[PDB]
PDB file of C-alpha atoms and ligand atoms in Angstrom:
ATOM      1  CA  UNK A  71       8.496  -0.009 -15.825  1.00 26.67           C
ATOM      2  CA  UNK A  72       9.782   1.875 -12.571  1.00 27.56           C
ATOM      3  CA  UNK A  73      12.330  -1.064 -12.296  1.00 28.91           C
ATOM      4  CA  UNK A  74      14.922   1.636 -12.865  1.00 29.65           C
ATOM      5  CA  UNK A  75      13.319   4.316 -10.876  1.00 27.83           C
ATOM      6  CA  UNK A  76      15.823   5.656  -8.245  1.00 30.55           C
ATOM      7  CA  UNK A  77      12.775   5.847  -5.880  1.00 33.34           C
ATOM      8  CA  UNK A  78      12.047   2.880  -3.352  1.00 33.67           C
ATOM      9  CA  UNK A  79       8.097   4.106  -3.553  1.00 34.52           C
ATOM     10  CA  UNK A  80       8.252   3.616  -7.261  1.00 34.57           C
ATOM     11  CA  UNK A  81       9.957   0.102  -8.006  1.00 32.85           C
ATOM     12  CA  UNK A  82       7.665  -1.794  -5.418  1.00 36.26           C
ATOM     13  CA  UNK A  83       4.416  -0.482  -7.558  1.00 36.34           C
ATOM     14  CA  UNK A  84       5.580  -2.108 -10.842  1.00 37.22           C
ATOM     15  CA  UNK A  85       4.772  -5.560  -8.396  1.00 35.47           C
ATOM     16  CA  UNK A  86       1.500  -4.152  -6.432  1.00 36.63           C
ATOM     17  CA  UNK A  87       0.731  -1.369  -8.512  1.00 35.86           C
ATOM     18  CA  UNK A  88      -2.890  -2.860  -9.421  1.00 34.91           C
ATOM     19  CA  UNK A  89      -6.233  -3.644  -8.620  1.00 36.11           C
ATOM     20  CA  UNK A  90      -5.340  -7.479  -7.849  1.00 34.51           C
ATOM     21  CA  UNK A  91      -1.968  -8.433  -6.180  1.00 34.12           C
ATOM     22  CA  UNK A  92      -2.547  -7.362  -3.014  1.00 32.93           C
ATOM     23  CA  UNK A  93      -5.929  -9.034  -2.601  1.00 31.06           C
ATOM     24  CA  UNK A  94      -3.485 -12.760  -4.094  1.00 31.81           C
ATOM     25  CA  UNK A  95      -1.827 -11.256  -0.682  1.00 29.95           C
ATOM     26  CA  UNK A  96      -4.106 -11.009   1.377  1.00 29.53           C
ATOM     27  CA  UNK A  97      -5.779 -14.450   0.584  1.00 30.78           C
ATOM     28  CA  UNK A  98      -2.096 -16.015   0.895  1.00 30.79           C
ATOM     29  CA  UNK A  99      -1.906 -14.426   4.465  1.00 30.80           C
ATOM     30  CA  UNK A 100      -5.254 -15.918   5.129  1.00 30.03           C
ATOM     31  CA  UNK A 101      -4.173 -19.616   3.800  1.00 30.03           C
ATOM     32  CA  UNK A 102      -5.575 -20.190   0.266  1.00 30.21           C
ATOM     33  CA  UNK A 103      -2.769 -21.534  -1.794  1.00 32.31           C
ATOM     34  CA  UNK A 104      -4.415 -23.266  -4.818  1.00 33.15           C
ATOM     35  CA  UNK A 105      -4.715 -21.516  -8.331  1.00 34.24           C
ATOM     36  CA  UNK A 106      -8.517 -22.377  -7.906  1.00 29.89           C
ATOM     37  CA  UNK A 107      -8.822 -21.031  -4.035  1.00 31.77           C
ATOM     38  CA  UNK A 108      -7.709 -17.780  -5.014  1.00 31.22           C
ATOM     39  CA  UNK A 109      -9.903 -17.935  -8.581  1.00 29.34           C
ATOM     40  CA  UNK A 110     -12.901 -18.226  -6.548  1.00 26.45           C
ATOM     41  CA  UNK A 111     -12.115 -16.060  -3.621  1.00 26.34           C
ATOM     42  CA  UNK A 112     -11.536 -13.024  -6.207  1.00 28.95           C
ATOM     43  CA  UNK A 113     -13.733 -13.704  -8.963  1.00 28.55           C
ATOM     44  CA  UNK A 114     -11.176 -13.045 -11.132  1.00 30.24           C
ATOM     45  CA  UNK A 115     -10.968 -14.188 -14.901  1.00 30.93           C
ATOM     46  CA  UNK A 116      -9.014 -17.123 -14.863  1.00 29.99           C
ATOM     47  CA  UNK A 117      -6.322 -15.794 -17.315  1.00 28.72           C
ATOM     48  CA  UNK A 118      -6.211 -12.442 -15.671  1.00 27.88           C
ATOM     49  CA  UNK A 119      -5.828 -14.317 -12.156  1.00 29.77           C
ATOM     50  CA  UNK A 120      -3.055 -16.341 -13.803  1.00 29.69           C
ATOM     51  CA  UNK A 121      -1.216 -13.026 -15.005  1.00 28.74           C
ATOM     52  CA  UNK A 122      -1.207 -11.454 -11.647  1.00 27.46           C
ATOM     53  CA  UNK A 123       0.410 -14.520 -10.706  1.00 29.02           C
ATOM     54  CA  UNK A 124       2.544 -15.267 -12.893  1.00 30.04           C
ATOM     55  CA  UNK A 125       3.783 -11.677 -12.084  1.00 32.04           C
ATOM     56  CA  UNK A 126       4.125 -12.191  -8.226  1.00 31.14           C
ATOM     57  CA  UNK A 127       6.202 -15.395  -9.025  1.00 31.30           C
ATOM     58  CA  UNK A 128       8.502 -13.632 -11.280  1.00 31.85           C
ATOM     59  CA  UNK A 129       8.629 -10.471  -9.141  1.00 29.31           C
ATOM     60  CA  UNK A 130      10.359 -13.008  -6.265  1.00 29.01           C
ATOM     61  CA  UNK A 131       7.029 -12.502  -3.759  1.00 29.28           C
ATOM     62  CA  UNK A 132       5.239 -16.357  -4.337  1.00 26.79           C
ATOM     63  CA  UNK A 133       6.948 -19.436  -5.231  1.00 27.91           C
ATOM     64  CA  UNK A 134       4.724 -22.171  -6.797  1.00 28.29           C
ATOM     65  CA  UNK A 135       5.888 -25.616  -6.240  1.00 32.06           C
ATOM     66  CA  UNK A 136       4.065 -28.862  -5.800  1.00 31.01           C
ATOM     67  CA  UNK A 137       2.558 -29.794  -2.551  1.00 30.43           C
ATOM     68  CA  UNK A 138       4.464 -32.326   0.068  1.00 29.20           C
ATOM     69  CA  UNK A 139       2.070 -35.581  -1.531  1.00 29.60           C
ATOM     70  CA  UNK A 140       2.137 -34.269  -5.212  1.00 30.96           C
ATOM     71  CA  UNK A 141      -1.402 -34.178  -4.633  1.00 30.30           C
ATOM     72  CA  UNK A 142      -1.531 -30.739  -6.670  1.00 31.04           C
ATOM     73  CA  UNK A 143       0.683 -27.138  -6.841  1.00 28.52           C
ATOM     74  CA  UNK A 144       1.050 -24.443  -4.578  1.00 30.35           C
ATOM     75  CA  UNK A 145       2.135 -20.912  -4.300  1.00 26.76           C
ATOM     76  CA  UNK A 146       3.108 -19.871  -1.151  1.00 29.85           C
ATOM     77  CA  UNK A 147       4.595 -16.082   0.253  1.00 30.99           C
ATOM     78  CA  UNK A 148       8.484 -15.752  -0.501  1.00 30.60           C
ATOM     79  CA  UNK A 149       9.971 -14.130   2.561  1.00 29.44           C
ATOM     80  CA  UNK A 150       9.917 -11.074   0.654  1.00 29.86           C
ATOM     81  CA  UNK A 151       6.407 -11.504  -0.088  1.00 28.54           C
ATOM     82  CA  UNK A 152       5.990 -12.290   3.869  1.00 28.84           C
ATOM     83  CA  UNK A 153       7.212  -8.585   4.669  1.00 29.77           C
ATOM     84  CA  UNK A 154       4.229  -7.275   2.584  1.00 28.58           C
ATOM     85  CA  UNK A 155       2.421  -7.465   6.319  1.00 26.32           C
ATOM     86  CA  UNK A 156       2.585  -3.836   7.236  1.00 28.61           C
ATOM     87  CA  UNK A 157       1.476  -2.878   4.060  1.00 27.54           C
ATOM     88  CA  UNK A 158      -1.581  -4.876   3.971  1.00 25.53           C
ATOM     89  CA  UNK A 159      -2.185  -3.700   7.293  1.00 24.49           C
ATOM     90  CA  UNK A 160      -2.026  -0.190   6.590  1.00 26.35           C
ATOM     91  CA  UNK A 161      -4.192  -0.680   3.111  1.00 28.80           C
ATOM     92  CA  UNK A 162      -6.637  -2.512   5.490  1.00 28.32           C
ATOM     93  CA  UNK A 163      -7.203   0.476   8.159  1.00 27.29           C
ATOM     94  CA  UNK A 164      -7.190   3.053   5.656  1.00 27.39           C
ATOM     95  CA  UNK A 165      -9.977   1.235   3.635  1.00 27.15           C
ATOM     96  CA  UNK A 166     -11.159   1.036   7.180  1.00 27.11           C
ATOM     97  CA  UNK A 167     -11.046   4.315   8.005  1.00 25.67           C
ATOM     98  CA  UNK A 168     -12.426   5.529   4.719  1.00 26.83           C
ATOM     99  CA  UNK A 169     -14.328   3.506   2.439  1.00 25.50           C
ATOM    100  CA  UNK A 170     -17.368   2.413   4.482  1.00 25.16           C
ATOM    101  CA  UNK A 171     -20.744   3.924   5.356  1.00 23.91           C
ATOM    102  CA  UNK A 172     -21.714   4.241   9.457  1.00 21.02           C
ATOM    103  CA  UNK A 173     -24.305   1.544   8.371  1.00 20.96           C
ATOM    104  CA  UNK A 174     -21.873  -0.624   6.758  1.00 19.75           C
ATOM    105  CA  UNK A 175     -20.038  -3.352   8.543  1.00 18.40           C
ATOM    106  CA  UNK A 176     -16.917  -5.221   7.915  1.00 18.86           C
ATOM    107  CA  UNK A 177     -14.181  -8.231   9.031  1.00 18.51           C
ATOM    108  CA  UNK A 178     -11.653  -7.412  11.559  1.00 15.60           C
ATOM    109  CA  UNK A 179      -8.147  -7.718  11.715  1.00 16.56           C
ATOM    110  CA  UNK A 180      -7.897  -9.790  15.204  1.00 14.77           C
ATOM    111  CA  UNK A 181      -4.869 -11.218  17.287  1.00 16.12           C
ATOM    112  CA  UNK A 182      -5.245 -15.260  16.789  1.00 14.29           C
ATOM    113  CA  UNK A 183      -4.993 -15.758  21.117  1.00 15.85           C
ATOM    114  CA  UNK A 184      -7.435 -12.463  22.193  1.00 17.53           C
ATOM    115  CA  UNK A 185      -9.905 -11.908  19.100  1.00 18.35           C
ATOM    116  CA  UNK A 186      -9.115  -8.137  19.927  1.00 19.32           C
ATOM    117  CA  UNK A 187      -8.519  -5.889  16.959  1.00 19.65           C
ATOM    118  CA  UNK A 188      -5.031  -5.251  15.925  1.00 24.03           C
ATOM    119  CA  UNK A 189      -4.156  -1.756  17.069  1.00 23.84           C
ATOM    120  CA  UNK A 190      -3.778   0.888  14.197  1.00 24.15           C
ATOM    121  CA  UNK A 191      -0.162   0.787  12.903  1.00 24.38           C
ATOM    122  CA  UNK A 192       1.600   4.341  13.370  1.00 25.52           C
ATOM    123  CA  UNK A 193       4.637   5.530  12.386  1.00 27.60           C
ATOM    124  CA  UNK A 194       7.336   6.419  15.178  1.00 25.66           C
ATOM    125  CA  UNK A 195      10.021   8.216  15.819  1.00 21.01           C
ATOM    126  CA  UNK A 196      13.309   6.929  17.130  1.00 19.63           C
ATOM    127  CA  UNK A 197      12.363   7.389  20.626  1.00 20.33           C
ATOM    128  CA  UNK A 198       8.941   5.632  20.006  1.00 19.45           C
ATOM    129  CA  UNK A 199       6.502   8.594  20.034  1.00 19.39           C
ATOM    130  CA  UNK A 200       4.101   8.794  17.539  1.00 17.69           C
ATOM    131  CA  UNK A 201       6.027  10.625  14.089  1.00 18.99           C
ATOM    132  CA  UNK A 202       3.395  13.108  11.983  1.00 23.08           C
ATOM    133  CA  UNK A 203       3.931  13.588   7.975  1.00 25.17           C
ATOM    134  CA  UNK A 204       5.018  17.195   8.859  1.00 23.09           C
ATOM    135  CA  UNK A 205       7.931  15.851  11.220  1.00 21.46           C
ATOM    136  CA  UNK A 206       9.271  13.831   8.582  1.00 26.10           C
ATOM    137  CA  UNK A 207      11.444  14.950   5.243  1.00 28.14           C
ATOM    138  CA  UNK A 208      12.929  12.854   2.439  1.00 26.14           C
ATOM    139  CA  UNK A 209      16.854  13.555   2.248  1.00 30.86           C
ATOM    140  CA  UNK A 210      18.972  13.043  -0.942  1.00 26.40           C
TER     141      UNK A 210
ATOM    142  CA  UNK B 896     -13.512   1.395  -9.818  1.00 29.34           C
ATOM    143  CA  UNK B 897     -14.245  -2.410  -9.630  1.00 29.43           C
ATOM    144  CA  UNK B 898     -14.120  -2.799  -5.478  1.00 31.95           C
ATOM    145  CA  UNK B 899     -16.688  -0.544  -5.143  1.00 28.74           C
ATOM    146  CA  UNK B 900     -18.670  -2.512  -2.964  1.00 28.42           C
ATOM    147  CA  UNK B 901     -16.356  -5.294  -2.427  1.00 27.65           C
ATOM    148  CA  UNK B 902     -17.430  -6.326   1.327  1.00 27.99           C
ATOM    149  CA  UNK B 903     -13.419  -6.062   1.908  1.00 29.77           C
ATOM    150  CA  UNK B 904     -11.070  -3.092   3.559  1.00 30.60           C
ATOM    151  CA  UNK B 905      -8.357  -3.951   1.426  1.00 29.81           C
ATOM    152  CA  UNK B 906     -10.015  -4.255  -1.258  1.00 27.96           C
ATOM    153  CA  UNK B 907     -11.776  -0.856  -1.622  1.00 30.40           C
ATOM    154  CA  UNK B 908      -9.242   1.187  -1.650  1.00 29.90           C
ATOM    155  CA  UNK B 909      -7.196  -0.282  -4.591  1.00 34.67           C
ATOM    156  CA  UNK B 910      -9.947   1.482  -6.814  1.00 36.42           C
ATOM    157  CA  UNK B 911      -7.794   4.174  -6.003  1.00 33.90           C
ATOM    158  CA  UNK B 912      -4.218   3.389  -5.299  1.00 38.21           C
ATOM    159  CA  UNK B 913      -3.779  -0.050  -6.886  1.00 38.19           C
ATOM    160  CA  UNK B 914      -2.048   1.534 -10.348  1.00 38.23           C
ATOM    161  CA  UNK B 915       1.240   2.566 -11.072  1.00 39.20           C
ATOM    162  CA  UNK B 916       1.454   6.617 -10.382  1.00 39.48           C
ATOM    163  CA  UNK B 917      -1.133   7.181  -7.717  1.00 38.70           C
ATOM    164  CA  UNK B 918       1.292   6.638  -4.599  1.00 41.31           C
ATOM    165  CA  UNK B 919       3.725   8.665  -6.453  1.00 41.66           C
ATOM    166  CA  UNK B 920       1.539  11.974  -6.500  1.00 44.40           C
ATOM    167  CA  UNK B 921       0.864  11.013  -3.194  1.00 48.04           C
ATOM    168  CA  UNK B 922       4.825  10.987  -2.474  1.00 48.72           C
ATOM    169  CA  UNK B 923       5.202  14.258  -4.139  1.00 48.63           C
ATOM    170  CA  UNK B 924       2.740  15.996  -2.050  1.00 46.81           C
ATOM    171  CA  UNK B 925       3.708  14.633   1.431  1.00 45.34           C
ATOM    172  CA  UNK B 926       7.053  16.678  -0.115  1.00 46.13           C
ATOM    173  CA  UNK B 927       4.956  19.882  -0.778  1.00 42.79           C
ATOM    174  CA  UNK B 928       4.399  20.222  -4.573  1.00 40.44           C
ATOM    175  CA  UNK B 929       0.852  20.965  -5.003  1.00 39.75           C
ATOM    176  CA  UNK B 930       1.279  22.429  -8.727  1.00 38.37           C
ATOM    177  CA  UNK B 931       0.410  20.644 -12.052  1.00 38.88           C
ATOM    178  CA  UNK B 932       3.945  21.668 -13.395  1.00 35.40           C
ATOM    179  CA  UNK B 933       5.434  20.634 -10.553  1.00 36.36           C
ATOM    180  CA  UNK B 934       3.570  17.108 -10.720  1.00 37.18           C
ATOM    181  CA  UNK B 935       4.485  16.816 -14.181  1.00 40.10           C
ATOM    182  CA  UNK B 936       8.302  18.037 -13.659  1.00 39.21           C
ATOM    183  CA  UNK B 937       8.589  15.220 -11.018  1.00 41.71           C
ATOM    184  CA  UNK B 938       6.631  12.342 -12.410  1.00 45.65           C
ATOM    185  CA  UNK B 939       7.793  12.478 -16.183  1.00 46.81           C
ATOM    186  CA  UNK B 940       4.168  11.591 -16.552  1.00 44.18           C
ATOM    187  CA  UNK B 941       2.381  12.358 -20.055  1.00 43.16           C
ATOM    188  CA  UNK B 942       0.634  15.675 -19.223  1.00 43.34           C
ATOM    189  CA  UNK B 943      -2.950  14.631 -20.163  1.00 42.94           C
ATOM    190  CA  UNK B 944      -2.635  11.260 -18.663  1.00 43.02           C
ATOM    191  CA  UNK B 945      -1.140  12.897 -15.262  1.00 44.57           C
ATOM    192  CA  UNK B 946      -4.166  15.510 -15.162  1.00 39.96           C
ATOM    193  CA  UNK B 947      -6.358  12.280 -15.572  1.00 38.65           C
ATOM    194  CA  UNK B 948      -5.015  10.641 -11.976  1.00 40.30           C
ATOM    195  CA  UNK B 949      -5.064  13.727 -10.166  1.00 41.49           C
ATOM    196  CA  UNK B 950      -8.809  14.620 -11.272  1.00 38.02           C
ATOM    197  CA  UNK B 951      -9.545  10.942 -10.156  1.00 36.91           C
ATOM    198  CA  UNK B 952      -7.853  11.156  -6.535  1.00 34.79           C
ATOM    199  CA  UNK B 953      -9.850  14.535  -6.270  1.00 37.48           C
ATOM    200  CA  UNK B 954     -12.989  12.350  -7.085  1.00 39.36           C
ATOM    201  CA  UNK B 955     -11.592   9.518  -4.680  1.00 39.82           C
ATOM    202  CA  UNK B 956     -11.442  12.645  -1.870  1.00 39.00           C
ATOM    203  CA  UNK B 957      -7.842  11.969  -1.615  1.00 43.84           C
ATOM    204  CA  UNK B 958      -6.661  15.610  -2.753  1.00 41.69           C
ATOM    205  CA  UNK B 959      -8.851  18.792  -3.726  1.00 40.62           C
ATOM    206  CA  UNK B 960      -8.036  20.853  -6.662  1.00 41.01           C
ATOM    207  CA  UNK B 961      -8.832  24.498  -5.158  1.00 41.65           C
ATOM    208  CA  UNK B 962      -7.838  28.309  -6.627  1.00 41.47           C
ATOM    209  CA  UNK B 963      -4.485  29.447  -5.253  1.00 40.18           C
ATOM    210  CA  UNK B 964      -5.855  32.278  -2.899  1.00 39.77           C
ATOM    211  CA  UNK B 965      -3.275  34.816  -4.723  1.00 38.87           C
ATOM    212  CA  UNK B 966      -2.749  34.373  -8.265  1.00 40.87           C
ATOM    213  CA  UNK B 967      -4.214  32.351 -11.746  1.00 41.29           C
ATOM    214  CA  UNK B 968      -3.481  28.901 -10.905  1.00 39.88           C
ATOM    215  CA  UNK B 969      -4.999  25.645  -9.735  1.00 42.38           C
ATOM    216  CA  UNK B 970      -3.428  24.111  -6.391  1.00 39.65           C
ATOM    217  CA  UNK B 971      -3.671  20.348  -5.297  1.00 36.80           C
ATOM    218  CA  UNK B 972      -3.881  19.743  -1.693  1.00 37.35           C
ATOM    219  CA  UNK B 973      -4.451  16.290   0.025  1.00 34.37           C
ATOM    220  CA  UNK B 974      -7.116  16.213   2.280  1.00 34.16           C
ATOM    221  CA  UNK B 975      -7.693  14.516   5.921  1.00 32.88           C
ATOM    222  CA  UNK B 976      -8.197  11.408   4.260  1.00 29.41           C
ATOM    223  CA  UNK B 977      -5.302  12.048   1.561  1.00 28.60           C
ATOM    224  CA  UNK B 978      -2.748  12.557   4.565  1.00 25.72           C
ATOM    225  CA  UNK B 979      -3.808   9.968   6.238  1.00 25.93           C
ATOM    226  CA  UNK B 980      -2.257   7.533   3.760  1.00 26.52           C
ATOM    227  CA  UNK B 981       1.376   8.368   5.207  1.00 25.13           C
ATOM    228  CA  UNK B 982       1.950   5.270   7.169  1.00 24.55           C
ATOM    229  CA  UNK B 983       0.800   3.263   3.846  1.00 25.45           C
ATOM    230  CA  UNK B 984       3.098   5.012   2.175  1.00 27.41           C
ATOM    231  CA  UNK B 985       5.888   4.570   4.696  1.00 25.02           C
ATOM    232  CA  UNK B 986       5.138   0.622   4.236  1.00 23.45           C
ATOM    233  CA  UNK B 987       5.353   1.178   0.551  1.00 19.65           C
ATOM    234  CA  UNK B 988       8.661   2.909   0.813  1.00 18.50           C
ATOM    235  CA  UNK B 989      10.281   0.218   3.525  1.00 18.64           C
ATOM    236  CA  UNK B 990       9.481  -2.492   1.600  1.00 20.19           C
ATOM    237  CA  UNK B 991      10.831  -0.745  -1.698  1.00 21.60           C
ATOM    238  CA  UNK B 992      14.094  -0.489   0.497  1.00 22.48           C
ATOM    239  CA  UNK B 993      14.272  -3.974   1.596  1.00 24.20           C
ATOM    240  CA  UNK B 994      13.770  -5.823  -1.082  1.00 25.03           C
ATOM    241  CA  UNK B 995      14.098  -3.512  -4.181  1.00 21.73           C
ATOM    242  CA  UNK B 996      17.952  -2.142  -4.391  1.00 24.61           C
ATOM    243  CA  UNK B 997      21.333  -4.516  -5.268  1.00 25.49           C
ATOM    244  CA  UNK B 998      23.127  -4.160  -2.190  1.00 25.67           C
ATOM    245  CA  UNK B 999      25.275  -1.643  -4.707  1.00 25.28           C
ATOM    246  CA  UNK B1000      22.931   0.692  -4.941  1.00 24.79           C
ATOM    247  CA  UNK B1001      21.817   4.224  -3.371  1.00 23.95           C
ATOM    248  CA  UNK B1002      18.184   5.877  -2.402  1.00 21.79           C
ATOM    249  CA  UNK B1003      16.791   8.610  -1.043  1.00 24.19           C
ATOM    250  CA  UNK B1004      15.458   7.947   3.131  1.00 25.88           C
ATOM    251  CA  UNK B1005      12.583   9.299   5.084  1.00 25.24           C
ATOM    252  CA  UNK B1006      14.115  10.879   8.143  1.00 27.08           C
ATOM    253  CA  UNK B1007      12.723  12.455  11.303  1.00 25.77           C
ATOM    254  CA  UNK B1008      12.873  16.562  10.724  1.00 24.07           C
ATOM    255  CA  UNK B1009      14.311  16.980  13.810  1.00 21.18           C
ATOM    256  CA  UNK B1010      17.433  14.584  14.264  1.00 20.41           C
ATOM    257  CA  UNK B1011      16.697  12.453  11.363  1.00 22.04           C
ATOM    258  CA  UNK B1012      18.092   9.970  11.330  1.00 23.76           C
ATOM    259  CA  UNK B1013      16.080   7.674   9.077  1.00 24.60           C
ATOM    260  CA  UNK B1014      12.831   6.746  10.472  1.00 23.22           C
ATOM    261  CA  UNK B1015      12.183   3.455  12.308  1.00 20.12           C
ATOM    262  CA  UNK B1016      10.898   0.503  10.173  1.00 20.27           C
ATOM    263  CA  UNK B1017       7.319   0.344  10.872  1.00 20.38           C
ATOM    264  CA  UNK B1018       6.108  -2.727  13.095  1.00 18.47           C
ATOM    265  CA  UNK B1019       2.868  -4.328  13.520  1.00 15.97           C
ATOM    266  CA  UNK B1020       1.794  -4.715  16.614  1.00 17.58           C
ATOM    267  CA  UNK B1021      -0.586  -6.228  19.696  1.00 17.94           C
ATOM    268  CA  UNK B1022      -2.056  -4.329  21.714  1.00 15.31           C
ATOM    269  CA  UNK B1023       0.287  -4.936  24.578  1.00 18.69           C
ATOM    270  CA  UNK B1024       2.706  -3.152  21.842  1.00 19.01           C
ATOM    271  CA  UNK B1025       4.810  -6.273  21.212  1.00 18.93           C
ATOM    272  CA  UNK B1026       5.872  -7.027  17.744  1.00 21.61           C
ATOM    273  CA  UNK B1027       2.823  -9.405  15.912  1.00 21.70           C
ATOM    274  CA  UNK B1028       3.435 -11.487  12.808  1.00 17.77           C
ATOM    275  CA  UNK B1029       0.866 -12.289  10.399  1.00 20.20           C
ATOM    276  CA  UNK B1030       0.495 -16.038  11.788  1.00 20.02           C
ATOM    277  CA  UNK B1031      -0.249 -14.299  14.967  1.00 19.12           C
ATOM    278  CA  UNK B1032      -3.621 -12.487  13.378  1.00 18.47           C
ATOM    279  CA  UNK B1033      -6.530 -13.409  11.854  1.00 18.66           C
ATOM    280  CA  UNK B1034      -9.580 -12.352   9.848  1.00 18.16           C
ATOM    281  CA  UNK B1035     -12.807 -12.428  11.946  1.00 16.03           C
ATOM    282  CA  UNK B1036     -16.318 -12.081  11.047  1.00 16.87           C
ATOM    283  CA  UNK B1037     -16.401 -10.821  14.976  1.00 16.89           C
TER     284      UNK B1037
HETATM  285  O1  LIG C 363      -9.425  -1.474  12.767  1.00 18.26           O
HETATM  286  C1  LIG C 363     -10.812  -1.514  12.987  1.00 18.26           C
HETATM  287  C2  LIG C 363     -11.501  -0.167  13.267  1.00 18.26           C
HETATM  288  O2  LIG C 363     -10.548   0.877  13.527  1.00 18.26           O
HETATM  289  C3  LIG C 363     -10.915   2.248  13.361  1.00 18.26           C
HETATM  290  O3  LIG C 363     -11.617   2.688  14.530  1.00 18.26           O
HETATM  291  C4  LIG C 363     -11.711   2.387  12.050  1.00 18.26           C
HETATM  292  O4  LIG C 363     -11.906   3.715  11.603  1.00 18.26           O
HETATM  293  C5  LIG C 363     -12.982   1.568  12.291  1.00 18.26           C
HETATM  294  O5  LIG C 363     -14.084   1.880  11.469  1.00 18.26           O
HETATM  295  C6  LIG C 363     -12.524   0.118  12.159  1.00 18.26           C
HETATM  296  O6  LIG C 363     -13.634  -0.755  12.228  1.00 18.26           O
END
């Protein structure tokens, strides 16, 4: 769709573009790995659940294999799908940020070893300081 | 708008980014178009459909859609919240580089005004400032 857009913005969307895949993500990062974890954990129609899937596997961000005793089948983050991290972080603090009344509360984003929030993720310049939109510019 | 009151920060705001065009007006305005025709122009976007996703991130309060203060036209201009999605898109575009493009191939980079000098990859991180990887996080009811 934007597979042959020139724009690195554009071809990622054609794989996360939607209202699902990056909530599969986000439920991979947390550990659910079954067809049925993630069914349940979304809500989502088990057909439409399957496309989003079947999507991610094809787009090279889950592989779905068997599990070690055969027991059942797995999908698991590709490396590439691994590096969707910063993303799902930044979704996270802008929903965060935006999306919630004062009187509404919400899960945190902690460090494992500290249960203190993960620090907002900002975008730096070379020499580390923090880089505005305005101090930024897309070359050809 | 189906995450409307999902209880989870992700998940909200896909209502209004999680579709195929959204982060691309988004692109376009962090590079200063803030005209219909120049929307359109860039995005090669069916003209009625285009003026459907802009309307909707005005109703999302990503942009507003406000009289140019000399002249007959419309302008679109994100707001506080709008430019706030810069590091998301940053993460968007990284990604898109990494993982995207035959080793063959060429793209446009986000570069620092001033030197630039491509921008730095964007890094998670503890509060210490060290790098964290996702194993090193988790989700907390607090
Ligand atoms: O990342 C967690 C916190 O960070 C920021 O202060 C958000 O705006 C706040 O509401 C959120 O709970």
């Amino acid at each position: 769709s934007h597979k042959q857009a020139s724009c690195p913005v554009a071809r990622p969307l054609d794989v996360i573009g939607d209202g699902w895949s990056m909530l599969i993500v986000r439920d991979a990062f947390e550990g659910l790995t079954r067809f049925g974890e993630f069914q349940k954990s979304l809500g989502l129609a088990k057909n439409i659940l399957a496309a989003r899937l079947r999507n991610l596997v094809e787009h090279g961000v889950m592989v779905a294999v068997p599990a070690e005793s055969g027991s059942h089948q797995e999908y698991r983050l590709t490396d590439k799908g691994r590096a969707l991290f910063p993303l799902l972080v930044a979704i996270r603090q802008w929903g965060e940020d935006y999306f919630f009344a004062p009187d509404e509360s919400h899960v945190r984003l902690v460090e494992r070893d500290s249960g203190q929030p993960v620090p907002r993720l900002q975008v730096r310049a070379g020499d580390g300081s923090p880089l505005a939109a305005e101090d930024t510019r897309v070359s050809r």
